[PDB]
Amino acid sequence: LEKLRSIVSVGDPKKKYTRFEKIGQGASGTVYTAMDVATGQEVAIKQMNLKELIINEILVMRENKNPNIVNYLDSYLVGDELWVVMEYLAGGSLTDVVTETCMDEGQIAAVCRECLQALEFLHSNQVIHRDIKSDNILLGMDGSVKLTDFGFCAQITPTMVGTPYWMAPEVVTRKAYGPKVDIWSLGIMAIEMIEGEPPYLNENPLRALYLIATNGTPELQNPEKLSAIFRDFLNRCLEMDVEKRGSAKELLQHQFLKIAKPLSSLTPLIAAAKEATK
Numbered sequence: 001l002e003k004l005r006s007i008v009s010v011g012d013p014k015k016k017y018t019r020f021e022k023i024g025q026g027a028s029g030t031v032y033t034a035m036d037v038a039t040g041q042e043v044a045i046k047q048m049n050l051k052e053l054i055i056n057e058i059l060v061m062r063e064n065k066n067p068n069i070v071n072y073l074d075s076y077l078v079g080d081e082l083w084v085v086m087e088y089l090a091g092g093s094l095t096d097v098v099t100e101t102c103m104d105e106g107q108i109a110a111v112c113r114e115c116l117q118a119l120e121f122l123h124s125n126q127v128i129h130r131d132i133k134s135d136n137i138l139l140g141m142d143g144s145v146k147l148t149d150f151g152f153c154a155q156i157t158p159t160m161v162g163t164p165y166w167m168a169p170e171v172v173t174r175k176a177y178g179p180k181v182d183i184w185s186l187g188i189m190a191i192e193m194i195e196g197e198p199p200y201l202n203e204n205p206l207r208a209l210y211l212i213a214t215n216g217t218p219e220l221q222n223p224e225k226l227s228a229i230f231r232d233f234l235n236r237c238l239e240m241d242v243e244k245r246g247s248a249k250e251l252l253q254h255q256f257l258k259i260a261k262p263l264s265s266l267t268p269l270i271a272a273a274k275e276a277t278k
């Protein structure tokens, strides 16, 4: 308990941050967006009701930073609650983009490369995300990409966790968590970028679990519309055999990512997808 108090930041976050807006809530905690009073920068704040495992989870994010994730900024202990302050991007989510606009292969390759760089970083720190999906991809107006975990699924490698439509078959059937489940989920997110939705989204989420466990590798609606290079990338993300499925490091070398357009190419999609607060 004393070590946890020594690692956390000094101060009252109720005074250091303002304009709190709840953006998510679950069994594990609550997510807010807030304004850093001193810097004028918009941040994201997780509030979790609480110990040596918490110490390790805090230390790994305080000591390790990467441009493609929302980075740890501070943490506070308020009674029995731990508050973790992190970066935030206000342009929108990849969900907004795929539901409202149509991305071309160059824009998909740009997003895939940024997400894989975030995954390579997390996996190199023995962290598995377990909840990769467009909802967890935040976008800046300039097209910058940051991965979030607003469903509280990520953890340092030590129950069924994740969002059913994006879950790997080995997670559904035997909870075999490992870095490759994030690669599968990235392949499902690439299908969102092509088709607007993950496979089976018209079904209820529990029925989706049975379809994933039985079908395995999902099929595309119109595969002939895609380049052979993009089809190969998707095959490597969605391999049934975990050993054959690409790692984030291996997929960063894929020819598909070599057609990536600059991130600035995303700005018109982000602007069109954005629904202004009335």
Ligand SMILES: CCN1c2ccc(F)cc2N=C(N2CCN(C)CC2)c2cc(Cl)ccc21
Binding pocket: 057, 058, 060, 061, 062, 064, 065, 069, 070, 071, 072, 086, 121, 122, 125, 127, 129, 147, 148, 149, 154, 155, 156
């Ligand atoms: C807020 C930062 N953060 C994170 C961002 C973004 C993301 F999607 C997952 C993250 N989770 C990280 N870990 C550790 C913390 N515990 C609670 C969850 C798993 C993490 C790891 C590392 Cl090496 C660096 C940053 C991380």
